[PDB]
């Protein structure tokens, strides 16, 4: 009933760009604006724009994530990361970082803050999509 040729064309290009930008925002958090919350909301915005631009049945086949398990796994990833210090006799939620050397890449900083912030990120995407999709599909 509506010719959406232009909305569907643009939504396909911008989604690529928003997702890439959401991953950058997630990894940049430690040293620049971004992190789990901002990255997660930005990623959620990309999936929402796909739902807005197209329709629920098509986009649910296309991106068939279980957003509820992503909440539970998000939370457990973030809790577990916090037990790191119990290995080295340190209080819960002690965070660690070292500059390792990898030949392939180069000097690289590893941090427990990355998996911790990945857990935050998964919950944030999971809850945004669970909330918005549960309402949008509320028949009754």
């Amino acid at each position: 009933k509506s010719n959406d040729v232009l909305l569907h064309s643009v939504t396909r290009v911008v989604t690529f760009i928003i997702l890439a930008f959401s991953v950058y925002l997630f990894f940049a958090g430690h040293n620049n604006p971004g992190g789990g919350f901002i990255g997660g909301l930005m990623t959620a915005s990309a999936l929402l724009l796909m739902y807005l631009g197209f329709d629920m049945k098509s986009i649910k086949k296309a991106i068939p994530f279980d957003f509820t398990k992503m909440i539970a796994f998000g939370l457990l990833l973030a809790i577990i990361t916090g037990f790191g210090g119990l290995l080295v006799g340190d209080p819960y939620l002690t965070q660690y970082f070292e500059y390792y050397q990898i030949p392939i890449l180069g000097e690289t900083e590893l941090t427990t803050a990355l998996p911790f912030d990945l857990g935050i990120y998964l919950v944030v995407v999971g809850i945004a999509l669970t909330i918005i999709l549960t309402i949008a599909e509320d028949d009754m």
Binding site: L25, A44, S45, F97, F116, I127, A128, T130, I135
Partner: protein, 805 residues
């Protein structure tokens, strides 16, 4: 824990075993197992006569909660021994009677004997406690066990009405008494009564002396049914009769008399003690004797009788307190006489009144009625019941040669001595007491003639009664005949009691009156010649007989038509009123309207923050230590304020969402001007998802409306809104200024120093979130996760309310 401790609480231990005995030994009436305990505690206590009657006392203590000064101390003296023998002696006899009055087939003996042993152990605990808080603990368990017994037939409305009325009046008094006992501690440092009596000067010097006395007498006068708290006692007659005999005539109604006699050495010696005891006593004496005359159920008459006679004993304790005022300016014998009469009358009373409840019970049991209008002629049909009844009613009327004549003659003696007192305003009021007491003695005699002639004389009318009428079984008769026998024995041989029982109890009540090893003289005898007190008694007899012969006349009066006490209207209306008033006060708060709730809360906040800002002079502004406003911030801020003020005037929801967006975008712009890039980002992303959500909700919600401007409603709303805004700003400005004066280095200079070195990042906000304050971040995603799982539950689970409970 001595044996004397164990005896004291032994009835609670047997109460735990009673339900098993009933279950697994039903063959036997459970009372046979209960009877042994009061019977061995009687014999046990009888062994202390050797110590009390030689001037001794026995005291033992074990700490219970010594951090609050509460110790379980048992104390045996003359006063306490006397009440322990009544409680266990008459207890024995009432259990025996209850074995033949309650059939084991349809009666819940388990409930009955548990409540009754609860009471019995609570009553011993009251009279043997030296610690006032342990006495409070047992005093409230008697009120509890008492109401459980009044309610024993809990399916009947009268039973439940009486159980409530007793519990409320007596616990009201008990709560006040606890306040009284706490004031004694504040004066003396001890809840020990024997130690309070040692420090009695710290009591009588104190500004808390009279409040402590009133609060204590509130407890005593509720439990001993002194006017106007006596209204619970007639309504307690719904109990099974053994209970009326034991609790409500012979023991628990004498707990207030016990407490007043026990604390006479703290409080006596003053006009207020004298008058509170003597006046409340004499009104109760007169009110109860007059009310009894119009009662038409045997137990009604006997309940008002007991009220009356408790008022007689309370008046003697009141008259006797003058011994302490005079000390040794007078012969100790003189005013101590009233205290000897009080003790003697309490004993007598327990014998005739316990016996008369037991015969009223037999008459109900064997005729089906207790209504003096339907009884008549039972002298020949029920001759043992007739004889015990005759003896009790003659003793109660103070006819010789029974125990009650001696005590009533000692009462008239005490009263006439008090008229000689020439202190306490007795020069004026002495004869009023004597006359009011004399009138009450005439009404006592008359209610005893009414009960005797209407019940036992005339012609036996076999058709009034459903059942054929016969005397009671011997088992039922033993308890009233043993009590009736003591009426006679103490009448002829009163001095069995004189140095065994009565004199030691006098020493407990007047301990400073005599040197150690000095005994009071106690010689009780029937004939003292033609003195005033004999004429007063002849008086009472004549007046009583005249008024009885004139009853044809006054029975048609409006006074005789009613029987319910006129103070009951108060009780009843006050209760309906607590409920009505409660409901009115509660409805004005809990209106159901969310606006009222926010307006009450915000109004309270404005008044309290407003008052605190004025009281501490905290309205202030610091215009120097502020940063600059670029000219473009004046315009941004004006838009932000205009957008915000437009919201209450919008009436279409899509406009509302758009202007909320504007506001959201502008708050992100301020976060950029204020150097908060991670906030700008977050604020923008949250605002976007909130706009999708508002529209997903708008599919379900209706459109906005212009709601009409009720003048009062919306001007109050406006004034509250401005007052919240104004106070948030004023307190913001005052906090800025104190913060600037103070100059405390913020703790966040540590994050400036150590974010990169100790936590490896350059973004201080992210480092705080995941490292220095990472727990908050982990808790905040848990908030989101709960909100998401909550949204699923709220949309998908729809229950009717009949599924679970």
């Amino acid at each position: 824990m001595t044996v004397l401790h164990w005896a004291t609480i032994s009835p609670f231990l047997l109460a735990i075993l009673i339900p098993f005995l009933y279950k697994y030994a039903r063959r036997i009436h459970t009372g046979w197992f209960v009877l042994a305990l009061p019977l061995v505690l009687f014999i046990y206590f009888i062994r202390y006569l050797s110590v009390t009657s030689t001037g001794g006392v026995v005291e033992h203590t074990i700490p219970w909660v010594p951090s609050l000064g509460i110790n379980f101390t048992v104390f045996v003296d003359g006063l306490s021994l006397l009440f322990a023998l009544l409680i266990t002696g008459i207890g024995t006899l009432v259990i025996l009677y209850s074995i033949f009055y309650l059939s084991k087939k349809t009666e819940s003996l388990n409930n009955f004997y548990v409540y009754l042993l609860m009471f019995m152990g609570a009553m011993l605990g009251v009279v043997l406690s030296d610690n006032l808080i342990v006495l409070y603990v047992f005093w409230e368990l008697t009120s509890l066990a008492s109401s459980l017994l009044i309610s024993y037939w809990f399916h009947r409305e009268k039973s439940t009405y009486g159980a409530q009325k007793s519990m409320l009046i007596t616990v009201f008094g008990g709560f006040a008494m606890l306040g009284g006992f706490s004031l004694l501690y504040v004066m003396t440092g001890t809840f020990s009564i024997r130690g309070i009596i040692e420090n009695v000067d710290l009591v009588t010097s104190s500004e808390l002396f009279l409040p402590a006395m009133i609060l204590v007498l509130l407890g005593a006068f509720t439990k001993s049914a002194q006017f106007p708290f006596h209204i619970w006692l007639p309504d307690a007659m719904e109990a099974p009769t053994p209970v009326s005999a034991y609790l409500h005539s012979a023991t628990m109604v004498k707990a207030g008399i016990y407490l007043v006699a026990r604390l006479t050495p703290v409080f006596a010696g003053s006009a207020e003690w004298f008058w509170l005891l003597t006046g409340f006593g004499v009104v109760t004496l007169l009110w109860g004797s007059t009310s009894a005359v119009r009662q038409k159920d045997l137990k009604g008459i006997l309940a008002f009788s007991t009220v009356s006679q408790l008022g007689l004993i309370m008046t003697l304790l009141g008259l006797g307190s003058a011994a302490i005022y005079f000390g040794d300016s007078v012969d100790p014998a003189f005013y101590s006489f009233a205290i000897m009469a009080a003790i003697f009358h309490l004993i007598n009373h327990a014998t005739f009144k316990g016996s008369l409840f037991m015969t009223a019970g037999i008459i109900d049991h064997e005729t089906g009625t207790r209504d003096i209008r339907k009884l008549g002629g039972l002298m020949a049909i029920m001759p043992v019941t007739f004889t015990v009844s005759l003896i009790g009613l003659a003793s109660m009327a103070g006819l010789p040669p029974f125990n009650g004549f001696l005590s009533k003659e000692m009462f008239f003696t005490a009263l006439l001595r008090a008229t000689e007192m020439n202190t306490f305003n007795m020069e004026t009021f002495g004869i009023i007491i004597v006359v009011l007491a004399w009138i009450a003695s005439v009404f006592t005699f008359l209610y005893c003639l009414i009960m005797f002639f209407k019940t036992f004389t005339g012609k036996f009318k076999p058709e009034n009664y459903d059942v054929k009428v016969h005397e009671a079984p011997i088992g039922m008769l033993i308890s009233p005949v043993i009590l009736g026998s003591l009426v006679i024995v103490f009448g002829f041989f009163p001095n069995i009691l004189a140095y065994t029982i009565i004199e030691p109890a006098m020493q407990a009540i007047l301990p400073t009156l005599l040197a150690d090893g000095e005994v009071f003289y106690v010689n009780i005898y029937m004939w003292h010649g033609f003195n005033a007190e004999l004429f007063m008694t002849m008086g009472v007899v004549a007046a009583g007989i005249i008024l009885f012969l004139m009853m044809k006349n006054w029975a048609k009066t409006a006074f005789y038509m009613k029987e319910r006490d006129p103070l009951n209207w108060f009780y009843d209306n006050s209760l309906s009123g607590v409920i009505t008033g409660s409901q009115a006060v509660t409805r004005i708060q809990m209106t159901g309207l969310l606006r009222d709730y926010f307006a009450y809360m915000t109004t309270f906040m404005i008044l309290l923050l407003g008052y605190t800002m004025f009281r501490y002079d905290a309205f202030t502004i610091d215009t120097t230590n502020v940063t600059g406003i670029a000219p473009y911030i004046w315009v941004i801020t004006l838009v932000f304020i205009a957008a915000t003020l437009s919201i209450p005037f919008i009436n279409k929801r899509i406009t509302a969402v758009v202007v909320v967006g504007v506001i959201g975008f502008l708050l992100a712009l301020l976060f950029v001007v204020f150097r908060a890039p991670d906030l700008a980002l977050t604020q923008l992303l949250v605002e976007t998802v909130t706009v999708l959500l508002l529209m997903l909700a708008f599919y379900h919600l209706p459109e906005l409306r212009k709601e009409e401007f009720k003048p009062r409603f919306n001007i109050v709303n406006l004034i509250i809104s401005i007052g919240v805004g104004f106070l948030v700003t004023a307190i913001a400005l005052s906090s800025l200024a104190l913060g600037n004066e103070a100059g405390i280095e913020p703790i966040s200079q540590f994050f400036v120093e150590n974010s990169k070195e100790l936590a490896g990042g350059y973004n201080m906000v992210n480092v705080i979130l995941v490292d220095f304050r990472g727990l908050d971040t982990l808790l905040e995603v848990l908030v989101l996760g709960i909100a998401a799982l909550g949204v699923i539950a709220l949309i998908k689970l729809r229950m009717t309310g009949r599924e679970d409970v």
